[PDB]
Amino acid sequence: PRIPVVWIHGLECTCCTESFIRSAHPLAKDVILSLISLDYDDTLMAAAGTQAEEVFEDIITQYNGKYILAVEGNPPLGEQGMFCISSGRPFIEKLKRAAAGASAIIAWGTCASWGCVQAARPNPTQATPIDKVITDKPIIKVPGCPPIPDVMSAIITYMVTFDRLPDVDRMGRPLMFYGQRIHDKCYRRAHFDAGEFVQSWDDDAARKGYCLYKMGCKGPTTYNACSSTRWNDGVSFPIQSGHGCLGCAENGFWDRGSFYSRV
Amino acid sequence: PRIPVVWIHGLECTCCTESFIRSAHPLAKDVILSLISLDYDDTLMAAAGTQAEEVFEDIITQYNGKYILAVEGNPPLGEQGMFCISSGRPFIEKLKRAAAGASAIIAWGTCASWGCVQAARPNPTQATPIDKVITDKPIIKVPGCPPIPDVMSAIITYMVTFDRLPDVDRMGRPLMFYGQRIHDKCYRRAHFDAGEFVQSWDDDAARKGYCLYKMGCKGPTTYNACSSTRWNDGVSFPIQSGHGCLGCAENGFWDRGSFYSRV
Amino acid sequence: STQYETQGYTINNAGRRLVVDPITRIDGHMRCEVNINDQNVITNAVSCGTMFRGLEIILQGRDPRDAWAFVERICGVCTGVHALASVYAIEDAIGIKVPDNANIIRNIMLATLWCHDHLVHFYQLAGMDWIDVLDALKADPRKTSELAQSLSSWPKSSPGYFFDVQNRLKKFVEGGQLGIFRNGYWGHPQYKLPPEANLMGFAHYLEALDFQREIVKIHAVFGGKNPHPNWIVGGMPCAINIDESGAVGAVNMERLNLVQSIITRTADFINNVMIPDALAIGQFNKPWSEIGTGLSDKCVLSYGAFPDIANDFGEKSLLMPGGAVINGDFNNVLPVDLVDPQQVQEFVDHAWYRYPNDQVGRHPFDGITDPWYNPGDVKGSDTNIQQLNEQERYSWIKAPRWRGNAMEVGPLARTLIAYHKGDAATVESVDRMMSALNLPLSGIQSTLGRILCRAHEAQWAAGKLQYFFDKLMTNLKNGNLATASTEKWEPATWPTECRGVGFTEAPRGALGHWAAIRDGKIDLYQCVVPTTWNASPRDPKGQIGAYEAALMNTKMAIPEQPLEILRTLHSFDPCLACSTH
Amino acid sequence: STQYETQGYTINNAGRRLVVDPITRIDGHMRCEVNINDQNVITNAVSCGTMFRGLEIILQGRDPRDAWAFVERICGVCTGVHALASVYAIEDAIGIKVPDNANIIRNIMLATLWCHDHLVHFYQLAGMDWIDVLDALKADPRKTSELAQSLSSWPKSSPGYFFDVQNRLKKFVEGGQLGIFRNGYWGHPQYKLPPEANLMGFAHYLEALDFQREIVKIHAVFGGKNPHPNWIVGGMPCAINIDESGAVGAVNMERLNLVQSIITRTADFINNVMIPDALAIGQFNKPWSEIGTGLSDKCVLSYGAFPDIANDFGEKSLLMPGGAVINGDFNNVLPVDLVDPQQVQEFVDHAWYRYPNDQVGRHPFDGITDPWYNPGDVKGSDTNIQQLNEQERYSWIKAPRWRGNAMEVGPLARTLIAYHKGDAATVESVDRMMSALNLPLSGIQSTLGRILCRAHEAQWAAGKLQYFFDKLMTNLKNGNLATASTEKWEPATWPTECRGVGFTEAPRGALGHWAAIRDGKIDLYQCVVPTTWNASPRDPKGQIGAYEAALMNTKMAIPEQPLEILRTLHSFDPCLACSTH
Numbered sequence A, B: 001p002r003i004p005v006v007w008i009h010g011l012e013c014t015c016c017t018e019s020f021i022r023s024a025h026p027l028a029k030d031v032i033l034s035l036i037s038l039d040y041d042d043t044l045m046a047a048a049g050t051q052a053e054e055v056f057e058d059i060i061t062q063y064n065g066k067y068i069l070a071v072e073g074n075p076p077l078g079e080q081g082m083f084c085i086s087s088g089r090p091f092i093e094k095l096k097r098a099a100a101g102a103s104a105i106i107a108w109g110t111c112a113s114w115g116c117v118q119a120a121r122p123n124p125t126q127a128t129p130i131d132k133v134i135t136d137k138p139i140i141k142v143p144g145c146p147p148i149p150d151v152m153s154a155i156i157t158y159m160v161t162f163d164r165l166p167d168v169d170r171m172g173r174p175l176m177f178y179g180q181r182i183h184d185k186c187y188r189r190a191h192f193d194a195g196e197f198v199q200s201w202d203d204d205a206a207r208k209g210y211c212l213y214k215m216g217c218k219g220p221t222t223y224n225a226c227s228s229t230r231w232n233d234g235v236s237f238p239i240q241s242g243h244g245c246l247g248c249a250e251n252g253f254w255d256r257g258s259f260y261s262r263v
Numbered sequence C, D: 001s002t003q004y005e006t007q008g009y010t011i012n013n014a015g016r017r018l019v020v021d022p023i024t025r026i027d028g029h030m031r032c033e034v035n036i037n038d039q040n041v042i043t044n045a046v047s048c049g050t051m052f053r054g055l056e057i058i059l060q061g062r063d064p065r066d067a068w069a070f071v072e073r074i075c076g077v078c079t080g081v082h083a084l085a086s087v088y089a090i091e092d093a094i095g096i097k098v099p100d101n102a103n104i105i106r107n108i109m110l111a112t113l114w115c116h117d118h119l120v121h122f123y124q125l126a127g128m129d130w131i132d133v134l135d136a137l138k139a140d141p142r143k144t145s146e147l148a149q150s151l152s153s154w155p156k157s158s159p160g161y162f163f164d165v166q167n168r169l170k171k172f173v174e175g176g177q178l179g180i181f182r183n184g185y186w187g188h189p190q191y192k193l194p195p196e197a198n199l200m201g202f203a204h205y206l207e208a209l210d211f212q213r214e215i216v217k218i219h220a221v222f223g224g225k226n227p228h229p230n231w232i233v234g235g236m237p238c239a240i241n242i243d244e245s246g247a248v249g250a251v252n253m254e255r256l257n258l259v260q261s262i263i264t265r266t267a268d269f270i271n272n273v274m275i276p277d278a279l280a281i282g283q284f285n286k287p288w289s290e291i292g293t294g295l296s297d298k299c300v301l302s303y304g305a306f307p308d309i310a311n312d313f314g315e316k317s318l319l320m321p322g323g324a325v326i327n328g329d330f331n332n333v334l335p336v337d338l339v340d341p342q343q344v345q346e347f348v349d350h351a352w353y354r355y356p357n358d359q360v361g362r363h364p365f366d367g368i369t370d371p372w373y374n375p376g377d378v379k380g381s382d383t384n385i386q387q388l389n390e391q392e393r394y395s396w397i398k399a400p401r402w403r404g405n406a407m408e409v410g411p412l413a414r415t416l417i418a419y420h421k422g423d424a425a426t427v428e429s430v431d432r433m434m435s436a437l438n439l440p441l442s443g444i445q446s447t448l449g450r451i452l453c454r455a456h457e458a459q460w461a462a463g464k465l466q467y468f469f470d471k472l473m474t475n476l477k478n479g480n481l482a483t484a485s486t487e488k489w490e491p492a493t494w495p496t497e498c499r500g501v502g503f504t505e506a507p508r509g510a511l512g513h514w515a516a517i518r519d520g521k522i523d524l525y526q527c528v529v530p531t532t533w534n535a536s537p538r539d540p541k542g543q544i545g546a547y548e549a550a551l552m553n554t555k556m557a558i559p560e561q562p563l564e565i566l567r568t569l570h571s572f573d574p575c576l577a578c579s580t581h
């Protein structure tokens, strides 16, 4: 038997679910077929409507205390929670029901971890991260917009293989992938040290891969694995393709000034 | 019709030929079937003995002045050249005959470019690089022990697509991949600049990916693409897997002191 | 109960009410209700978007150069398309022209998205409406090999392969942990494929799930990552260096070689796996050529996309045609103008928003996004919707109209516009496809037609990837490397007040972003998105949108099992985050 | 001319002389000469290594910690195995014991090399001796599909696939640029496959050329790069961190996931592509079970490899057994000791080197590498050789012997040793293979048998990769992370004078490095390599080595076309850079 997993969705753009299916090793196919039992997921499941409600109720009842709850997105507190409606009622009610039976919770992405774009000024829906609503369960935060595909699958395989949650920093992020800054493992750091900077797009410096600090790179304040593990089977990351880090793994990154203003 | 290529082998270990077939994009299959005509190659060809000699003669006669000569390895001047014998004669005679009909010469690897391991002290065979014997033909040096697979295939695709030789530095190395040092694009540079070094193998610093300078890393004096393009479809490079650079793309790298003495 | 007439339909809310909430195998966040008569035929259909975030509000006061990064997060499924529309809109406002390589690369980014998004929809989202997965356990592996080999040259077809796939599914099911297959519609009488076709289709579902991850490596090379690649106002940030020192720091011959390898593999998969599977669904389900027509024989809309002449958005430049048809008159394809206030307008009389006068429609340069949750009597409470009240406000999606007409957008819409403008390639392709199915042209205006059109667009986009790559390489051979214009990067160079429109064809249909800039900041930012059109609620005349129309008049075999509703809704590829933003 | 008797052969150099120089589809650097009688039967065979570099001379005065990197460059085909032998030798001399995870990772490095080197040999080196590539143009694609599907569950078998491969080959040759196929032996009467089997094997040649690049990703993870990965004295440099800060700088769960993915894919390709093709070659070429026996029914040697108990090189630890057989007595598997001066010795009476007494053999701790190019009374001259003189010195390869006996090493040798020691997995594999061909056990002692044993060993090594990976993960679950011992890393900790032996089984056979350290520097470093055994020249008794013996008594159909000589030589996988170093 495989460990039961329930995956729910609040206010979100689906980027973390899409990132998960990009995994190169293990393939998402093999995670679903061999490593976990993905027992509820609105984006992939056959059943809809009353048949999907029956799956949800049956799984959280039969496996009470024993399933992992994956959460993508967040609950809005505005309009009595009716900015996000599921089966006719506020999403927050489904979140609390699912959390009550879970052994542990994975908060995928900056939305579930912190708030992300819907929580940026002026936050019209009062979007609120999972840990401010669910206060009596272990929550592992895996931030990024979205997190790296092979980081997502590595965290899953760690938990299944070792039969334990990853060790975390003071904010609940796994030490393995969030312990160091982007700028502490960046291949352009030689240029930063030398004062060798891109000053305007497509200048001679940009064509030699010089540092993006003066173009607004937020690598120096951002914790993630993009400059080492990289993205999409190791093919690239934002800086390697010529754009500064946005700071997308960090709480409040949308409201720290323009992406093109210096750290 | 595809461009004729003759590939010959002096004193060598076959590592550059093996590197070529590791190419991820284009596949070596597609280079041989669709981009070039690989008309002579002792490691792959069907014909042997007198039938292989007939191929060599027919190709260099019918395509005189029109083929590219690829060279792996180097000629020995000791024992009248009989440290490397081909068709019962010194290898140097096959090199001179092949070079005379070529439009241009690609010196693959540190052996062909500089000497490599057989030329390290005391150089028992008097192994000598190609450009000290052939002085009247363009020679592009592609050094490394061996060079990176997808560098080899990118140089080939450049030459076919653009119908010209790559621009070179003052040593004859392509600027595209040999213009910068390993240490100028190394992802551990932040640790170098902070004084954060591995001091003994498998210490706490080693387990965090700290800089390998105190373990003998020669990245500061070595020009190649290993820290940006990386090896084997981008999977790794020497430093990323925990060993300092040996300096293997540079002339004389075997005789610069121990690999574990600081640069 | 009441009844009224609109667009040739009789909308009647007598009879049994059925609710489908959640709709699954979409991004999320949709509710559907219908009424059925005593013959189990739909006489009323209600489309509801169940979430809202408010990106149009969040964008106020941002730097226009940053806008693309915010609006890209409207959606991670159609990832990149909102960034493209944003940079187009800001460049139109300020008066910026980009270099030819930046335009070519942006066209590569959009074609890559079309390939990926259309492929994953066919298999992972719509596929299980047509393939009975559990029935695959009854197939003969040798007969499955025989079927596959009769439809395609694709290599992966051995009897041992299909046996191995079948045994993996058997072991998955045997322990009772059916995962995504639990409590499905398996055995419904509208599943018409034989067991061998169900096994072949399931094997391909799994091949597509693996292969889709490779396509987006093109977005990683030019845009850093996928989902959510990076872009700039003025071009792209991916500087090019082929033959100079430091090419290790830029898009070089090795990076371009990787892109070419992905293009070839992507065309091969779509042409030899997806295309034959789509044609086979058509062969075994011909009655669905007459179900779900909706507005597709009445009113269809395309803005056009893929400008081949850099910075020229006119008819001679756009590779994917734009135009509008209304009142079923396909002999007169009409021109679209996104600045004309009498063309695109949005209504909120049946949506959860405030206007000063809800009986009139607002063009997006006059748009208002003032959320107001007000469901009226829903037979429960404000926090317990038992039955939406479609006589009043029932959705977070606004109601867009074109000259007051309700339109369908997306692959079928685009195919009909190009066909009736006389695009020769389109005419030939459509005629040959319908000939092979032994169906009339009118068969394309249906739920089956939406699926066939999407697959033939994936094929078209995979061919255009090679065309665009070859144009890039031609420029590099001629020494033209530029990827960004920075003459107007600094805000001191901008007009004090200006406005612009950015438009394209996203995988789901016509997309526009309307932006007004004042004193260096965003003053207004309004989006009208393809699923906003298709999933629209009603307007002050009671006119119904594309989803509600396509569900009207549909027979259900088993009212409690909504397979026919799912087939038609999934044929549009709904993106509800896009629809509400 | 002369005639003498040795090892049951009559060695006779009267009659017509044939020369094959260059030997191709090897690493390079071999010359072969034979004499044939009136009946086209080989009566004399001469094996010559035509290069030398002198690594044993270059290593003098180097730091022992550096030696692995120099000797790795003996060979890029068997890349890594000389580094492994080196670190073993230096650790044996100094008295270093490595942590369990370093030993497990070294075993993974060796098993990875076995899988890669054996697979590439089967297709790219030996395959064209058995497959007639031009005859593939005559095959029927549907009959090719049917054949492939009768032999294997491998998915890639459609008629369309085989037609596409056939058309690629047809296009390749239609400009008259035949490349690697030019002036081949196509149509020779010894080509016995039907056209459908030629097309199947050629498709597989191309599949293997593509797939082999993936296997070595395991070397890149643990060793940085392939070819020529990195190692250390004391363990491996690839520090592990699974669950602590900074795991992005080390071997972490994502890196281990990549290794697991390669292992599964490698096992699947070997078991479903290489294994059925090797058996098919056997079915269609059964007479080659009686050709090329040589020394394989007389004298065979293995040192043994893959220590499962860290730092224990004894019989209870080694997963691949060691032992020697002489005089055809397979009932008496003898133990091997690499320190005993009466066991391994090298002679130079027929090689281009100086000894104080060339009539005696020297153990490697007493070894001498003093090059002396002296070909004597050749036909032609010293810089233009027409015929080597095998009565005098004729090669850069030294002549190794075991207790004075000439031995065969490599996959067939190891298989015979393991079989006759009673290894259960070996006995089962061999018995099942020979049963499938309806051949007696003695059929393995042959040119065909060498090929079958190599395929057997690729399957064995792919299974052991999973075993070792699981052992690594079990240690990590228990908190055992160590990868290096550094208490004797500094030279001041070493004995002032010490010596050691490092040994293993490389893909081509028994490998040993003998090292002496004095005053912190290498004082002596001698290598005896598998192809040095098999390609050996004669000794003072006139005893012949494995290649010369396997060529004796072979019938040739066409004397001017050396196909039968190539088949037998290629069956040993010659590595001439290894042989001479």
Ligand code: SF4
Residues within 6 Å of the ligand: A182, A183, A186, A187, A188, A189, A190, A192, A210, A211, A212, A213, A217, A218, A219, A220, A239, A244, A245
């Ligand atoms: S590009 Fe960004 S992360 Fe990299 S060195 Fe420069 S500032 Fe730091």
Ligand code: SF4
Residues within 6 Å of the ligand: B182, B183, B186, B187, B188, B189, B190, B192, B210, B211, B212, B213, B217, B218, B219, B220, B239, B244, B245
């Ligand atoms: S590991 Fe080597 S190349 Fe990298 S920063 Fe340190 S010294 Fe430089």
Ligand code: FCO
Residues within 6 Å of the ligand: C075, C078, C081, C082, C506, C507, C508, C509, C511, C529, C530, C531, C532, C575, C578, C579
């Ligand atoms: N395609 C797509 Fe998403 C929607 N609807 C956008 O734009």
Ligand code: FCO
Residues within 6 Å of the ligand: D075, D078, D081, D082, D506, D507, D508, D509, D511, D529, D530, D531, D532, D575, D578, D579
């Ligand atoms: N295998 C191999 Fe190479 C040889 N002979 C070594 O050692």
Ligand code: SF3
Residues within 6 Å of the ligand: A012, A013, A014, A015, A016, A017, A072, A073, A108, A109, A110, A111, A112, A116, A117, A144, A145, A146, C073, C076
């Ligand atoms: Fe993956 S849902 Fe996409 S917006 Fe930033 S994390 Fe959220």
Ligand code: SF3
Residues within 6 Å of the ligand: B012, B013, B014, B015, B016, B017, B072, B073, B108, B109, B110, B111, B112, B116, B117, B144, B145, B146, D073, D076
């Ligand atoms: Fe590729 S042959 Fe290998 S030793 Fe250093 S380059 Fe030489």
Ligand code: F3S
Residues within 6 Å of the ligand: A144, A145, A182, A222, A224, A226, A237, A238, A239, A244, A245, A246, A247, A248, A249, C225
């Ligand atoms: S923008 Fe996000 S994806 Fe990585 S490089 Fe910066 S944390």
Ligand code: F3S
Residues within 6 Å of the ligand: B144, B145, B182, B222, B224, B226, B237, B238, B239, B244, B245, B246, B247, B248, B249, D225
């Ligand atoms: S040893 Fe060679 S492979 Fe690259 S990292 Fe240093 S130049």
Ligand SMILES: [Cl-]
Residues within 6 Å of the ligand: A110, A114, A115, A116, A117, A119, A250, A251, A252, A253, A254
């Ligand atoms: Cl946030």
Ligand SMILES: [Cl-]
Residues within 6 Å of the ligand: B110, B114, B115, B116, B117, B119, B250, B251, B252, B253, B254
């Ligand atoms: Cl050198």
Ligand SMILES: [Li+]
Residues within 6 Å of the ligand: D091, D092, D095, D096, D097, D311
């Ligand atoms: Li030891």
Ligand SMILES: [Mg+2]
Residues within 6 Å of the ligand: C056, C398, C526, C527, C528, C529, C581
């Ligand atoms: Mg809007």
Ligand SMILES: [Mg+2]
Residues within 6 Å of the ligand: D056, D398, D526, D527, D528, D529, D581
């Ligand atoms: Mg030796």
Ligand code: NI
Residues within 6 Å of the ligand: C074, C075, C076, C077, C078, C079, C575, C577, C578
């Ligand atoms: Ni979307």
Ligand code: NI
Residues within 6 Å of the ligand: D074, D075, D076, D077, D078, D079, D575, D577, D578
């Ligand atoms: Ni070798």
